[PDB]
């Protein structure tokens, strides 16, 4: 049906690859199987090599490199890709260890990005960018500061963009009258070789004056619309500079991204809750 072909200026060497978004099932990473198409004159003695990379930039800290030689040799999709090509069609087969940093980049390249590089030379160029990605498989926080503040989330797993609902319970016995309630979202993006980032904040001047109870639900939504101008914002894997989502929530060595909900009063005791922000499997 659909398969991606890449070539260099001379085009003697072509790489056919089925997918370009590798799903980490957390036990078996979708194996990387591709086909190299060459000619005899352009190679003759020089063998055909291909490489998988996990290049981390910001510094080029490739946490892993493996070499598989298309020619000489050392799967059905490979079968069908080969049958159309003939003698100079040679498979390469890389297997990603399950424990690699997923594909995350930083909006100004930087971050984590896999890659398949295909070349031909005598002794161990086509640049095919791939990525690692994951699919989406009841938070409750308390604080007795008086000012009893309880927050709860309907569910922990929310897809990118879907609104998140927060139940707030404010019991105020005190004489200290509230000014605001802010339900904010914090995106922690730790660069490992953990910075707070405000992405959404539904502030309402809901004041619960002495000896009172406040019980209502807020709905907050972190979106890239207002986050376009946030330096260090962890975006998801960018293929050839497409437009990407927010760096999803890692499910555990590169950049570690987590997401929490913070319910802050301005009196100002608060709470914090985590949630998952990964796309669902289509």
């Amino acid at each position: 049906t659909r398969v991606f072909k890449k070539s260099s200026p001379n085009c003697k060497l072509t790489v056919y690859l089925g997918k370009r978004d590798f799903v980490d099932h957390l036990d078996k990473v979708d194996p990387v199987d591709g086909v190299v198409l060459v000619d005899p004159d352009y190679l003759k003695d020089r063998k055909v090599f291909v490489t998988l990379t996990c290049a981390f930039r910001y510094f080029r800290k490739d946490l892993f490199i493996a070499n598989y030689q298309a020619f000489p040799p050392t799967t059905r999709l490979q079968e069908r890709l080969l049958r159309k090509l003939g003698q100079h069609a040679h498979p390469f087969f890389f297997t990603i260890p399950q424990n690699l940093p997923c594909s995350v980049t930083l909006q100004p390249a930087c971050g984590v990005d896999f890659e398949i590089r295909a070349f031909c030379a005598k002794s161990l160029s086509v640049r095919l960018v791939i990525r690692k990605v994951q699919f989406a498989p009841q938070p409750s926080a308390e604080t007795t500061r008086s000012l009893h503040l309880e927050a709860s989330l309907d569910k922990e797993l929310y897809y990118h963009g879907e609104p998140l609902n927060v139940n707030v319970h404010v019991t105020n016995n005190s004489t200290k009258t509230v000014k605001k309630i802010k339900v904010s979202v914090r995106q922690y993006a730790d660069i490992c070789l953990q910075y707070k980032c405000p992405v959404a904040q539904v502030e309402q001047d809901d004041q619960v004056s002495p000896s009172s109870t406040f019980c209502k639900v807020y709905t907050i939504t972190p979106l890239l619309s207002n986050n376009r101008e946030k330096r260090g914002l962890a975006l998801d894997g960018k293929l050839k500079h497409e437009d990407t989502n927010l760096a999803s929530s890692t499910i555990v060595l590169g950049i570690l991204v987590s997401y929490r909900v913070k319910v802050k009063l301005v009196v100002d005791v608060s709470v914090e809750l985590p949630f998952v922000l990964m796309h669902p499997k289509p």
Binding site: T1, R2, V3, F4, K5, K6, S7, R20, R80, L81, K84, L128, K240
Partner: peptide, 7 residues
């Protein structure tokens, strides 16, 4: 760039 074709 990542070209195209078929199968």
């Amino acid at each position: 760039e990542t070209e195209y074709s078929a199968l």
